[PDB]
Write a protein that binds this DNA or RNA. Sequence first.
DNA 1: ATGATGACGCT
DNA 2: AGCGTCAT
Length: 431
Amino acid sequence: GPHMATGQDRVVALVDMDCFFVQVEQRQNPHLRNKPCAVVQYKSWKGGGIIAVSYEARAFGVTRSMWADDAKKLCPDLLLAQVRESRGKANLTKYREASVEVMEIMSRFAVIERASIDEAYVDLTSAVQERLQKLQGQPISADLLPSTYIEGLPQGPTTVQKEGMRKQGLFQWLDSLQIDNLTSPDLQLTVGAVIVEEMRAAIERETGFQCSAGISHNKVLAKLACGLNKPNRQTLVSHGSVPQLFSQMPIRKIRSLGGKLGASVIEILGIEYMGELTQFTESQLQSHFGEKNGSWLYAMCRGIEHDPVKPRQLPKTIGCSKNFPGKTALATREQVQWWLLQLAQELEERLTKDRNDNDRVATQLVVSIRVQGDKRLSSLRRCCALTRYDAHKMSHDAFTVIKNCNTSGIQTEWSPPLTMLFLCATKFSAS
DNA sequence: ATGATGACGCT
DNA sequence: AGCGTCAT
Ligand SMILES: Nc1ccn([C@H]2C[C@H](O)[C@@H](COP(=O)(O)NP(=O)(O)OP(=O)(O)O)O2)c(=O)n1
Ligand SMILES: [Mg+2]
Ligand SMILES: [Mg+2]
């Protein structure tokens, strides 16, 4: 009772951009706005691979990883924007620059953890404390929360349209809120949501991009919350909402459980939903999934997680990769060297920009290859020192550390053919 | 023949 | 170090 911690100590948000690469392209080209639209890479293979899809196009069943030629079968009027190509490969600079626009705005409000090119976690615990004091003790108006859903509401005795349902739940929540108690976790979450409304308003005003967000007590619930009412809405998931929410929540939807661990939780325990984990002891879970995973699952199915919002706005690595599928797998030494040089040249440009922008230098170069006949992301990784931002030196060094994989007795030929090259700059130091 | 990335755990 | 998982 009095000593059972409830994981309600923090206010955490996750802000995720809506159909992000599409919005970047729609801002640039007004002809694409409010249309079924997708972003594709490499136009020559079946129209290009789709990597982002507007919500209008999603309505036709267009999805990521679809070939554009196939997407056009579902959506004849689908509009497309192509990823830039430079040095023979996709170049994602435009989307990285747009990401920086958004991350810099979020950073005005609180220290963020950059979690992907289009999302960040926010620890709003301190900002909420400050706002509660500035608030005399006055009630929180629904007008301060114009795009907020309260997960689980409305409920109970006694509209058929979306916005009507959103307001009814919000009214139930606010009507029941105690504002007298500055330490109520529900009150803290509500103030957190007010601040996220302000943050999302700033992002849209200053960039033109819309986003969604989740507000909860930890990263996993905030991430889950964010997706519940996409696009262009934010969702508050209270501690109290967790038992019903998890009662029918497939295990694979919780971050980190979407892969083999999640599958084994399902198979080994014979369950389907996150809430069903509560039936097991902490020791039982640890026996099946290990000390760390066991403890994490035991707490997480109760809505509790302690993973901190890390103070990190910048990527820890900078890398360049290219696949060479099927018949195009690299089979000559000079092929391998030309492409390593292409990669190294992009990497040099990004590293030099990074060193000017962020006062740091990378010190290790990691070279990864995939071999024809494998299936793994990487077949092989080798590292060496990164001592100069020079593409010719980097590409020469990368060849040095991988050139012995070449089983071919003939020196001009490469065997077995390479289906992927990857260069990654790592181990940054202040500069 | 998704592809281009990026974080972090394990031994 | 180098490999494996999970992720957008
Ligand atoms: N497998 C993936 C997933 C995302 N991305 C890129 C394109 C996406 O626009 C961007 C952000 O990914 P995302 O947040 O998962 N989805 P996106 O923002 O496009 O749509 P939402 O569902 O978030 O509204 O990363 C990618 O290149 N490969
Ligand atoms: Mg997104
Ligand atoms: Mg995202």
